[PDB]
Amino acid sequence: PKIHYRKDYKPSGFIINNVTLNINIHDNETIVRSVLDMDISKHNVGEDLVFDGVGLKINEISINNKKLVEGEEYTYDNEFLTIFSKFVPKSKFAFSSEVIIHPETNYALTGLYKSKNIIVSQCEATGFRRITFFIDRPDMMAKYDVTVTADKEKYPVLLSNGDKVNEFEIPGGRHGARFNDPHLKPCYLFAVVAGDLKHLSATYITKYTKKKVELYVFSEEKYVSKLQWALECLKKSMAFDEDYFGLEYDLSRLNLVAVSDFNVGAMENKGLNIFNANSLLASKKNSIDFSYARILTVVGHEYFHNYTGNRVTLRDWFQLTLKEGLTVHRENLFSEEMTKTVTTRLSHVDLLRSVQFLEDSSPLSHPIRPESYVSMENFYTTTVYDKGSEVMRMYLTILGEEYYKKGFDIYIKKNDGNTATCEDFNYAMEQAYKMKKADNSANLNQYLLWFSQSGTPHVSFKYNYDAEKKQYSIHVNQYTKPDENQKEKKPLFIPISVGLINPENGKEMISQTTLELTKESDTFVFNNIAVKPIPSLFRGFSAPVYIEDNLTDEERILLLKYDSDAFVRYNSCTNIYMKQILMNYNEFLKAKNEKLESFNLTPVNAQFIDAIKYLLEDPHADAGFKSYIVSLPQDRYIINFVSNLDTDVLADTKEYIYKQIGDKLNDVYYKMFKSLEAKADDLTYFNDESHVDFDQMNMRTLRNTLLSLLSKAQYPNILNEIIEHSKSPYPSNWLTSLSVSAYFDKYFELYDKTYKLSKDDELLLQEWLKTVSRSDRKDIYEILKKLENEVLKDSKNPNDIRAVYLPFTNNLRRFHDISGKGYKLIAEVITKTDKFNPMVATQLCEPFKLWNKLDTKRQELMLNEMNTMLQEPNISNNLKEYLLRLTNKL
Ligand SMILES: CC(C)C[C@H](NC(=O)NCc1ccccc1)C(=O)N[C@@H](C(=O)NO)c1ccccc1
Ligand SMILES: [Mg+2]
Ligand SMILES: [Mg+2]
Ligand SMILES: [Mg+2]
Numbered sequence: 001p002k003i004h005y006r007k008d009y010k011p012s013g014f015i016i017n018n019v020t021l022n023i024n025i026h027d028n029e030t031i032v033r034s035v036l037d038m039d040i041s042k043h044n045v046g047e048d049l050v051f052d053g054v055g056l057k058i059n060e061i062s063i064n065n066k067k068l069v070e071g072e073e074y075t076y077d078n079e080f081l082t083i084f085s086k087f088v089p090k091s092k093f094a095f096s097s098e099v100i101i102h103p104e105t106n107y108a109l110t111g112l113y114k115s116k117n118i119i120v121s122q123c124e125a126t127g128f129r130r131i132t133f134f135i136d137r138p139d140m141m142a143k144y145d146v147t148v149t150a151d152k153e154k155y156p157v158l159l160s161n162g163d164k165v166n167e168f169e170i171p172g173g174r175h176g177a178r179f180n181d182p183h184l185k186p187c188y189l190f191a192v193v194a195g196d197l198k199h200l201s202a203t204y205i206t207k208y209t210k211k212k213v214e215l216y217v218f219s220e221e222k223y224v225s226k227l228q229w230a231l232e233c234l235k236k237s238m239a240f241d242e243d244y245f246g247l248e249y250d251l252s253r254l255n256l257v258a259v260s261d262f263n264v265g266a267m268e269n270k271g272l273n274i275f276n277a278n279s280l281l282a283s284k285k286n287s288i289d290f291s292y293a294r295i296l297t298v299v300g301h302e303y304f305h306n307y308t309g310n311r312v313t314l315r316d317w318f319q320l321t322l323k324e325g326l327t328v329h330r331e332n333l334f335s336e337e338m339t340k341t342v343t344t345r346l347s348h349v350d351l352l353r354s355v356q357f358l359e360d361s362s363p364l365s366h367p368i369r370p371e372s373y374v375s376m377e378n379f380y381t382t383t384v385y386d387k388g389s390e391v392m393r394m395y396l397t398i399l400g401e402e403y404y405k406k407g408f409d410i411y412i413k414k415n416d417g418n419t420a421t422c423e424d425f426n427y428a429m430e431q432a433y434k435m436k437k438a439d440n441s442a443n444l445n446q447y448l449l450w451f452s453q454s455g456t457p458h459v460s461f462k463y464n465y466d467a468e469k470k471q472y473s474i475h476v477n478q479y480t481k482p483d484e485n486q487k488e489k490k491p492l493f494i495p496i497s498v499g500l501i502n503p504e505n506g507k508e509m510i511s512q513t514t515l516e517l518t519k520e521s522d523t524f525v526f527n528n529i530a531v532k533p534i535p536s537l538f539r540g541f542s543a544p545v546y547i548e549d550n551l552t553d554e555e556r557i558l559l560l561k562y563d564s565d566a567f568v569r570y571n572s573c574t575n576i577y578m579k580q581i582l583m584n585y586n587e588f589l590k591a592k593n594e595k596l597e598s599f600n601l602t603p604v605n606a607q608f609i610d611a612i613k614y615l616l617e618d619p620h621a622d623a624g625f626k627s628y629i630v631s632l633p634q635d636r637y638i639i640n641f642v643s644n645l646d647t648d649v650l651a652d653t654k655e656y657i658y659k660q661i662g663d664k665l666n667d668v669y670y671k672m673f674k675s676l677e678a679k680a681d682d683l684t685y686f687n688d689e690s691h692v693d694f695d696q697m698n699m700r701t702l703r704n705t706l707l708s709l710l711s712k713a714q715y716p717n718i719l720n721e722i723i724e725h726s727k728s729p730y731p732s733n734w735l736t737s738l739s740v741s742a743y744f745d746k747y748f749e750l751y752d753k754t755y756k757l758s759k760d761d762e763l764l765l766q767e768w769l770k771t772v773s774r775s776d777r778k779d780i781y782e783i784l785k786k787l788e789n790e791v792l793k794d795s796k797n798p799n800d801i802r803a804v805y806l807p808f809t810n811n812l813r814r815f816h817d818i819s820g821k822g823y824k825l826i827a828e829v830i831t832k833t834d835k836f837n838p839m840v841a842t843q844l845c846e847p848f849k850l851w852n853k854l855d856t857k858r859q860e861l862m863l864n865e866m867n868t869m870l871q872e873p874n875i876s877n878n879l880k881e882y883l884l885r886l887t888n889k890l
């Protein structure tokens, strides 16, 4: 396989200054005429001129109006167009091509494609070469003049990046529009849209310079009323970047467009952000609550790229985390500020420690700046995004808000209108660090290891207290396991945000402080500590590490109850659960392997259960926090701590633990489920798509979490509550009624009822499909066949395919059926899907990532399916690279 290496980066021998496009859309073909105004760079050594160009049909090629001919002056192999150096001018020249492409058959949703009745592009990472020839890499920055023509009745709205400078009629019922983007950009930020779109709009006045910006949000006609919240989220995003970072929008207009068929969430094309409809469109009558947080996140994320990715872009793709990690971090500050609930930060931690930690202990493990790739599309990972964001967040923790803003400003100003690397960011942060320490000898050279070193660090603690001296010490060790990226791992710069809790009264003993661990180990000593404390470690989750707190369950309970930091309270709970899960797992596993007729299980700690009740019954504690404490840790978090995992034993372990706790707390759960009703389901703002109460949404989350626990328990008469819940005006409630009815005979009537409520809204149907897919049903395989035949059918909509299959793959008991039938089903879907959408096919591989963590029979079954997929003729390069890496062949 053809491998690109980070160390091999070289600037091009060519420059592309201006791109002038005519994109002429017809029913059965699109013709793209492109003039590239080019030049020879200072790095040129008289090499061939090689363009990327994939699946293009050439009508004509010229340089300076001299026609070039295949086999004489160029060769084209369906991937690369090579102009022989003899015909490459030695100074400024115009390269002209005309090619034919076919959006109407492009089911891979990269390049130019048709999504229902909208023509749309996706160019990041290597999609522009599917539209026309280019030197298709992010340091080739240029300015774009883009004309789009089409049938006016079918395609009345035409959009491309930047200022619309002309609109005109064309004979035969056609029309055109011309766009000029005055900002230099890489080709991955090119976009075009054509469709029968409707919009909402507003005007936004920038804060410092008072520039008037027209904001448009677009969709198909049917769903125009689902655009309001997105528009409001955009205004919120613009205000945040002004308020926190001082950054203003830089064009007269910004368009957001929803399309039904999209590989990911959204895309930051300059002035023309394109979204998966599931991450732009919502209405309160037709969407679950989580759609509102999702849209707020994705709109924000794309908006924040306008600086972190667009105005300062990437030198090369190995720098991806510089824009994605930093944009995730920006979006997280934005979301925490807009929601003002502790669950926003916890949800990010939850995601990282489950999905990203599993990735980092898998054969796919990579540093946030990879050393190599085959398909760049495989490096759009939770490691690059989520670990990346935590690395970018550590700078804020180390510097504090004031100096963080200073360093960010240095970065954004110095590199504006240009490419940048991860070193450029670290250098800006180092400047701020020197100012903060007041010491121009301070440096962040060590910090670079967060970019280059793979794996999750393990941080462990030992404590000592001397009562006579009133002096307390925290001794800290860090360890990262050797792996295929580094056989010797080096110590990182780990910022450890700490407090100290007095166990006797539950109060804070020190001003909060950040310990700067830079060695393999260090001891931090505190004076005037008046009683032996309980340490509150890694507040806010201050570095992306495995924490070994070395606390007893008695100490962890006291943090759970009395600590100020939501993360440490939640982590203390997590650790109590993990200790219990590991113990019970081992007990069940030994009894299974030894074929025992009888054995013991270690009960759940009774003081812990009491602490859960005390928290739940506290009217002034947070509803969102509560839903986290009654839930066990996610399965992917749990698996990071077990080798040779028997999934069936783990499923038995979880059930025992949940049952122990419910046998004590179910009456409390029921009483809270009833008492939360009035506030949770209050209809204030139910007609206001500009405002969401995130606290109230957390109350609904908690009710629905409680209802699941009570349903699984068969609590007396709970079916009655389930039927009532099915009449709620909130889809979050009435789809939960479906999910929780799985434990009762009523399941098929609620399946019909909710289907009928969901079936006329494309996105609500997809949420229904997920609700069915993750239903705790013994007959789930027969239900999936019914979905396939009655609803999914032959859809190529990635959202439909992902809705049916991915929730099911999280069913620990059924997906990991010891027959292998779960593995076989998902592998067939992957292979089926790979024949038209390689990106989506790789996304569907995600359940296989943990294969080498499983018991040996399940390893063998998964491995057999992976090798079967690898033997598929014409397997994409995406899927092949992914599977070869995952199976330790690459
Ligand atoms: C916008 C973001 C909140 C959602 C999503 N993120 C990921 O795909 N994250 C990586 C990941 C996370 C979890 C599991 C697996 C992967 C996504 O749509 N990414 C885009 C992107 O970065 N748009 O700016 C984008 C644009 C272009 C190509 C890819 C992705
Ligand atoms: Mg083609
Ligand atoms: Mg404002
Ligand atoms: Mg559809």
Ligand SMILES: [Zn+2]
Pocket: 301, 305, 323, 324, 327
């Ligand atoms: Zn992004």
